Design a protein around this ligand. Structure first.
Ligand SMILES: Nc1nc2c(ncn2[C@@H]2O[C@H](COP(=O)(O)O)[C@@H](O)[C@H]2O)c(=O)[nH]1
Length: 124
């Protein structure tokens, strides 16, 4: 089945655009990446950098994840991201999102060999 590394790329990577270019960004990208198939996912961040630069995070600053695990890493640089989160109008299967574009450090958790990101923890 899909691996956790492919799942993080599908859920979180958008190196095709530099930033969200309209208020409809998250509605179109949450539907097209299949993240509203079973239920509206309520929050989801996309990162607008190359895949190499996000895989490099797993060699930068180790930090504790929100839930206490110690395989999270925080980016040294800020990155261009879009935060999508559900709005009061959202109702399955017509999931609805507000798009917020921002430049933040990312914190991801890494696993495997090669050791790559498999979960988006937070933006700070
Ligand atoms: N699992 C996951 N959490 C995220 C993502 N983007 C942001 N978050 C987290 O979701 C939080 C906001 O969710 P909440 O505060 O409503 O449960 C932020 O504090 C951050 O920790 C994402 O793509 N996946």
């Amino acid at each position: 089945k899909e691996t956790a590394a492919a799942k993080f790329e599908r859920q979180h990577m958008d190196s095709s655009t530099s930033a969200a270019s309209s208020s409809n960004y998250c509605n179109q990208m949450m539907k097209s990446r299949n993240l509203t198939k079973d239920r509206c996912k309520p929050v989801n961040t996309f990162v607008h950098e190359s895949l190499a630069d996000v895989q490099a995070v797993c060699s930068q600053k180790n930090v504790a994840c929100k839930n206490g695990q110690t395989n999270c890493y925080q980016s040294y640089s800020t990155m261009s991201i879009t935060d999508c989160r559900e709005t009061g109008s959202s109702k399955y299967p017509n999931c609805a999102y507000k798009t917020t574009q921002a430049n933040k450090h990312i914190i991801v958790a890494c696993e495997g060999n090669p050791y790559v990101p498999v979960h988006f923890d937070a933006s700070v």
